[PDB]
Predict the 3D structure of the following.
Amino acid sequence: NIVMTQSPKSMSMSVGERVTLSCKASEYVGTYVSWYQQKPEQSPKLLIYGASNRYTGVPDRFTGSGSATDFTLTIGSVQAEDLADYHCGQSYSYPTFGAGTKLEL
Amino acid sequence: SNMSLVKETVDRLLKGYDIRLRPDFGGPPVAVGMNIDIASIDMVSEVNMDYTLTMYFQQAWRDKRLSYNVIPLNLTLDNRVADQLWVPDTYFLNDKKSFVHGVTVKNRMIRLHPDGTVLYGLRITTTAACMMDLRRYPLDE
Amino acid sequence: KVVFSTGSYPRLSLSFKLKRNIGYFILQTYMPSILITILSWVSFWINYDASAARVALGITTVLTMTTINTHLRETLPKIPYVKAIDMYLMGCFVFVF
Amino acid sequence: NMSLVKETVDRLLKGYDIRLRPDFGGPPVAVGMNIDIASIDMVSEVNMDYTLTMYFQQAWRDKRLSYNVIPLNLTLDNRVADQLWVPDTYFLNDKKSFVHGVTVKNRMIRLHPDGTVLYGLRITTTAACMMDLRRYPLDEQNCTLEIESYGYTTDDIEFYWRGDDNAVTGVTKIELPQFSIVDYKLITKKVVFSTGSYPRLSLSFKLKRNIGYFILQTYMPSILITILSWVSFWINYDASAARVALGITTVLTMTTINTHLRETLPKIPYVKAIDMYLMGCFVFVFMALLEYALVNYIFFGRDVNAIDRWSRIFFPVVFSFFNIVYWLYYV
Amino acid sequence: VQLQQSGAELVKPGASVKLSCTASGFNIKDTYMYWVKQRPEQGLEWIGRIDPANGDTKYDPKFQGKATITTDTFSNTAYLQLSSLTSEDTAVYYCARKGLRWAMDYWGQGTSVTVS
Amino acid sequence: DNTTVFTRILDRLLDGYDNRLRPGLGERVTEVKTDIFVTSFGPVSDHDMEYTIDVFFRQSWKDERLKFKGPMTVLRLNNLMASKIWTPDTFFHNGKKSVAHNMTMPNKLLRITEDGTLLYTMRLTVRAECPMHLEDFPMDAHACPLKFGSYAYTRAEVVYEWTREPARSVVVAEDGSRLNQYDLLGQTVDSGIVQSSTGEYVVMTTHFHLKRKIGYFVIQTYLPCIMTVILSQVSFWLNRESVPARTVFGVTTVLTMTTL
Amino acid sequence: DHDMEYTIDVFFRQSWKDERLKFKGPMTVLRLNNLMASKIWTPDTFFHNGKKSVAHNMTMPNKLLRITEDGTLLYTMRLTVRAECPMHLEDFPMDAHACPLKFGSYA
Amino acid sequence: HFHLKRKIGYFVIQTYLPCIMTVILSQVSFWLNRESVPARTVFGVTTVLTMTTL
Amino acid sequence: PVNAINMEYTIDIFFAQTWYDRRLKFNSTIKVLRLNSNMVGKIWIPDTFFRNSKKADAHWITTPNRMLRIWNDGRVLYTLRLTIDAECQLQLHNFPMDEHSCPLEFSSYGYPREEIVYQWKRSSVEVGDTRSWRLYQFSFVGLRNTTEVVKTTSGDYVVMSVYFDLSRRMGYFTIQTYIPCTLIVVLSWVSFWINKDAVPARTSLGITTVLTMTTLSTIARKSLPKVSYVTAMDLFVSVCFIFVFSALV
Ligand SMILES: *[C@@H]1O[C@H](CO)[C@@H](O[C@@H]2O[C@H](CO)[C@@H](O[C@@H]3O[C@H](CO[C@H]4O[C@H](CO[C@H]5O[C@H](CO)[C@@H](O)[C@H](O)[C@@H]5O)[C@@H](O)[C@H](O[C@H]5O[C@H](CO)[C@@H](O)[C@H](O)[C@@H]5O)[C@@H]4O)[C@@H](O)[C@H](O[C@H]4O[C@H](CO)[C@@H](O)[C@H](O)[C@@H]4O[C@H]4O[C@H](CO)[C@@H](O)[C@H](O)[C@@H]4O)[C@@H]3O)[C@H](O)[C@H]2NC(C)=O)[C@H](O)[C@H]1NC(C)=O
Ligand SMILES: CCCCCCCC/C=C/CCCCCCCC(=O)O[C@@H](COC(=O)CCCCCCCCCCCCCCC)COP(=O)([O-])OCC[N+](C)(C)C
Ligand SMILES: CCCCCCCC/C=C\CCCCCCCC(=O)O[C@@H](COC(=O)CCCCCCCCCCCCCCC)COP(=O)([O-])OCC[N+](C)(C)C
Ligand SMILES: *[C@@H]1O[C@H](CO)[C@@H](O[C@@H]2O[C@H](CO)[C@@H](O[C@@H]3O[C@H](CO)[C@@H](O)[C@H](O)[C@@H]3O)[C@H](O)[C@H]2NC(C)=O)[C@H](O)[C@H]1NC(C)=O
Ligand SMILES: *[C@@H]1O[C@H](CO)[C@@H](O[C@@H]2O[C@H](CO)[C@@H](O[C@@H]3O[C@H](CO)[C@@H](O)[C@H](O)[C@@H]3O)[C@H](O)[C@H]2NC(C)=O)[C@H](O)[C@H]1NC(C)=O
Ligand SMILES: *[C@@H]1O[C@H](CO)[C@@H](O[C@@H]2O[C@H](CO)[C@@H](O[C@@H]3O[C@H](CO)[C@@H](O)[C@H](O)[C@@H]3O)[C@H](O)[C@H]2NC(C)=O)[C@H](O)[C@H]1NC(C)=O
Ligand SMILES: *[C@@H]1O[C@H](CO)[C@@H](O[C@@H]2O[C@H](CO)[C@@H](O)[C@H](O)[C@H]2NC(C)=O)[C@H](O)[C@H]1NC(C)=O
Ligand SMILES: *[C@@H]1O[C@H](CO)[C@@H](O[C@@H]2O[C@H](CO)[C@@H](O)[C@H](O)[C@H]2NC(C)=O)[C@H](O)[C@H]1NC(C)=O
Ligand SMILES: *[C@@H]1O[C@H](CO)[C@@H](O)[C@H](O)[C@H]1NC(C)=O
């Protein structure tokens, strides 16, 4: 299968600066990743599809990027309501998911 | 629905259309703008003294018979309606062998802007004759 | 605009300026002729009385230069002038002869 | 009677639905197939294909095209094929095919009073045939022609050879220049794709290459050239220029014949039988040249009438032994 | 546009549970239906796939046999069967619609299963 | 009659049907579901930097003007029905010259299900551009692409997608490998957006990874070069006084090397 | 020189009188599209020494039609006739040839 | 009738000049002394071979 | 040209057919309706196809090159211009001194003997000047027309054949392979005039003769197709090769 190895487990910074994430694929997935958010006591919501395609309702601060193997999600001036857990998935094959990147103050 | 409205608009546009007459037939000449996106140049051959050129050959002109004032959108019609509309008889003089590509359909484009502008496009692979002065071969240009 | 017998017609002319790369022709035509010409002057070091060795050295590269000249030309068209590569091969053939 | 045939044809073609097959919602229509092989033109190895001309013929039953007053079979014109339903038969290994159009398009319709439509076509096809050239030129090719319906599955159409093994005729009269059709077989089966299961007929030939051309233009020149290298073993050892020139030009002729043979074949990544023979011959000639070099080294550098005494016996024996092994394996 | 699932379930280990989610505003014959497992304080784990127009199902190799996915046409509903429930099967389950560029567009509210 | 029921179903479907407009012209985007079944990966021409490929080109799209209620759920129709309905204008971006086979009858397929879902298979033989970097020739590997997309409809009008999983939407048949020089290692797909003079278009990509074999070249060039050098290596073992013999060694090895 | 043939690329002009196409209108000459050339009578000129000619269809078919108000017609088309130049090779390679191009009506 | 006249520029360089140089190469063997039998027979057979391939 | 490697010849004809149609009968002062090719698509024409043609096409520039004339009694004349690559089974034994009879067989495709019967006119076949003919190494000797009934799967068909007698001219191969090889084996016979102590000279002459005999065997085979049997040219090449090999031994 395809193994998603997004890192790190959690990051703890303040409100109003740039934070980036990373998702690394074991085998080739070509621009078919997806990024979701996971609030506590909440179902996941889609943010990015393809490699860097912004979904409807997503703010402009959420910028994604991608390649053949390396993928990332850059946040510009993260706010207090964005404090949740982020997931990286793929669908070039049968879909798999990563562990999860959290955010803290 | 909107589809039936577009249907009756296009059917009104092509009703009474004369393909034999250019736009402004008794008046001023029509201005046909051109722009080309070259895909590749494959075989510049000195044996046959020609080169093969693949291009996206676009043309644009204003037809006042094809103006609609109902739909606020550019209509990209099917590629088969281009045989029912007037198009310029553009040819290449140094042509030797040529074809519009026909897979999976005939590779042509027609798009009807609401003012009357028609964006006609073709995908052409042409073998144009190019006479070569090989006096400085192979250092020639 | 161009004027024919039936009237004056508009014309858009698109043109390119293609310049030919040299290194393939260096690798194929120029450098084997240079090396086969360097081979022809090995025969000056062999002693004068060794007839068979020196007339082998001469005749084989004469026939090589004329075979290279005839070989690189039937692929080209039947143009009636002399080319630059043709001039280089004729000069090398004059030196070998 | 012309008016009767006219009103009968106008009755048949009126209300005929081109889009629906015979028994469209009913059972699969059975289509019998006859093929008359006219010629096989170019069994080409460089393009991995063969060109085949045939009188392709199909026969099915349409119950809409049935008439009862007229007692003879109506051979209509070839332009009513655009009005009647015909099967969508294609060839899977086809590369470039056409139906001949002189003086008109070469197709045929002959309706029958029960409803049978005799549809005959003259098709020149260039079917792909991948060739195993491991044993070339003493090889054997199996070139096929896969006949299949495209849009209709097994529960909409079925294919059978009309007359069993008497369906395909004219094979024995064909005389390809370099091959020889030994056997042919007719196979009916069903292939399964992702869209459904489709009927398939397959006509295949067992071509056998003729050895006679190659045995006088590759094998016999190589044998005589390796014969010529054994002339060097009898020449006196002091004549350096003679034996050196003979051995060198023998090697150069061997490399010339193999390099000027292997460009008429496709760029296969393996070794053939003729390549194996022309490699063994090159090894023998190179060993002859190295034998002379050993004689010259053992005289001038360091019994010199004994090494070429042995090689006058040893080299004709091992090459005779090599031909026995080669013509036992590849035969 | 809304995927409404069932309620929370609590049964003994070794039993079987019926779990379901109803799709509204569209039809499930067009897009694939994806089932996913979310263990608490863990990452998401994909259960399986169903194509309701074809009826074909594809499952994860570690979930084969213990889980299967069924569907129906009139009710426009996707179902799960879970068999031989254990302690590690305690999680929350979502049904996810296939979206644009294979993206898991919509998600259900979640059904939490628990054994004791 | 028994066959009049399907005839009036088709005549009711095509009544008032405008084939010049795509489904939902002013309401939505026409999602086209595409997969490819490669029946033979043809020979790669190194001279033209091209390759040939025979494929079953399958496209599927939902049309709501082709809904019907009848005794048969799927209308497996012939090719004459295909020209009377709207079909997407898919073309190959890097194709050079491709033939849609029409022997004996046009090699097309059309299946209208009762909910309006269509399916449109074709036989093509695409000669596509494969740009090659021959720095490591003959021990080179290439990724020959096959890019296809719409010609006239932009990203806001017609989008393309794979009907199965992207790892399983290009299937290469087992017997279908006409490669003699190369060998096929695997496929690789990817969608994407291409910006042109007219607008932005969705281009789907299929990369075929190839890997050449030295078989032909370790018998035509490399081994006759090694034998040519070795045959000049034996000229050191001859007598010093043998001037014409070592001379003809030298000149014949130089001629064989330059003609190779 | 191998196939004893040449290839000319011409603007083959023809003109004839047709009294059925007399008209009276705002303009004297009528420069039209090509699709009326199949609608009207055109002469069936063929090349007696031809081997294979192409009508050069790209993009619209390269013919024109002009209908003068008195009925005079002008109908030119762009062709690429490959014709037969019978050759006598007795003085090769310093020979001179007179390659012919014969044309006339068929029916 | 289209009157064409061939230009001898390809054939002078391609055929006439190699024949003239080959038959001049045959004249080179006449200035060698009588004992150089391999030399003069190499001259003779190579010029005849060149004339046959020409 | 009569192509020997591919085994066909090209022919350009004015194929004309005449029949009777009682529906095309008119009573007026006009005797002949001289029509162009536009009226071909409206009336009946027999489906005459050429049974041994690999590829053929009519001529379509500037107009379809077809003629249609209808008399007042129903007689219809239909003439069209055709270029046919017809298959001739040239036996290459005796080559390059071969003689051949090239056929041109035509028949109706769909209509059997009970529906269309073809027939020959006394002076039907008309040749041209026989000098504009591109036959280079051959020469048309004459012609003969025959008719017969073949039996196929569909039915019995009337087949009309025209045989074209062509006899070859070897003047070309004399300068290709004959003279050239004869002068090489004459150069083989001068070795005997060289003294016996000149060993490298005579063996250089020998190896050059045998390698160029192999080369001329290879080159002259390129003109011939890939047939299995031996020709007289190949027999001459083999006799010259064994002569020079006998001289060397
Ligand atoms: C599979 O697909 C192919 C491709 O779609 C099908 O082939 C096509 O078949 C149709 C229908 O028969 C043909 O339409 C008709 O064409 C003839 C003229 O044919 C000549 O021109 C063709 C076009 O040439 C193009 O390409 C060349 C390339 O060099 C260029 O130089 C040209 O400029 C063009 O771009 C050419 O392809 C033809 O050659 C082919 O066919 C001949 C047949 O004899 C072969 O020998 C060749 O080897 C080759 O295969 C040929 O040179 C037109 O005359 C037709 O128009 C008349 O007839 C119509 C039908 O009756 C009618 O509606 C028209 O009004 C018109 O009628 C006039 O002429 C009649 C003549 O008697 C009169 O009777 C009538 O009264 C009136 O005056 C028509 O347009 C396609 O050309 C043909 N194309 C190809 C590529 O083959 C094939 O059939 C399909 N197979 C199956 C089984 O489905
Ligand atoms: C490895 C191969 C050999 C290399 C050799 C290198 C060294 C020697 C190199 C020499 C260079 C010479 C050629 C240079 C290039 C020009 C080509 C050309 O076409 O020239 C001309 C040919 O016009 C003629 O009239 C030629 C006539 C035959 C001449 C034959 C050689 C001399 C004869 C005696 C020989 C034996 C003497 C001794 C006897 C014991 C110009 O013709 P054009 O332009 O085509 O058209 C006509 C011009 N016009 C349009 C103005 C009217
Ligand atoms: C003119 C006639 C001459 C005849 C001579 C006869 C005598 C000799 C006898 C004959 C034996 C030789 C002929 C063998 C022919 C087949 C070889 C072949 O293709 O195998 C493989 C070569 O794979 C490689 O990796 C190539 C290795 C090249 C070695 C070169 C010589 C050694 C180097 C030092 C030399 C100098 C040493 C000394 C220095 C002083 C093919 O592999 P593939 O297909 O590419 O890949 C695998 C398949 N796959 C793609 C499915 C994974
Ligand atoms: C040369 O180019 C012209 C135009 O570029 C071609 O003319 C077009 O030919 C097609 C096919 O013959 C015509 O389509 C037909 O339309 C009728 C309806 O009138 C339909 O019933 C047929 O089934 C077919 O689809 C098209 O109308 C016609 N267009 C024009 C403006 O004339 C011509 O075919 C080309 N010739 C060759 C040899 O390529
Ligand atoms: C390749 O060859 C073509 C044709 O020989 C070259 O085209 C020529 O370009 C020059 C420079 O632009 C033109 O001259 C200009 O003409 C206009 C006409 O109004 C005038 O206003 C300018 O002052 C200037 O004199 C010339 O007309 C044109 N040739 C033709 C036949 O139109 C071209 O430059 C060459 N090079 C390249 C890279 O294409
Ligand atoms: C040329 O090659 C083809 C393909 O390899 C050969 O066709 C094969 O023929 C055999 C028997 O003639 C077929 O075996 C059959 O298997 C079925 C399985 O149910 C069995 O019921 C039959 O009784 C028979 O044993 C085999 O399927 C068939 N191959 C394929 C792919 O269909 C052919 O024989 C070769 N030779 C010639 C002269 O054509
Ligand atoms: C239809 O096409 C026209 C021409 O391309 C579009 O015109 C654009 O108009 C905007 C606003 O004035 C300009 O900024 C652009 O430069 C124009 N061109 C392009 C490339 O967008 C027009 O917007 C289109 N109409 C619709 C409704 O799509
Ligand atoms: C119409 O063609 C059919 C082709 O089958 C002919 O019917 C056959 O005639 C032969 C010869 O008498 C019989 O041996 C067969 O048994 C018949 N076949 C069938 C299926 O009936 C028929 O004779 C033809 N009719 C005419 C008038 O020619
Ligand atoms: C062949 O032509 C001659 C011409 O006189 C004719 O008599 C004969 O009947 C025709 N065909 C045959 C041999 O029946």
User: Anything to note?
Assistant: Residues 2-13 of chain B form the longest helix (12 residues). Chain B has one helix and six strands. The CA atoms of residues 64 and 80 of chain B lie 21 Å apart.
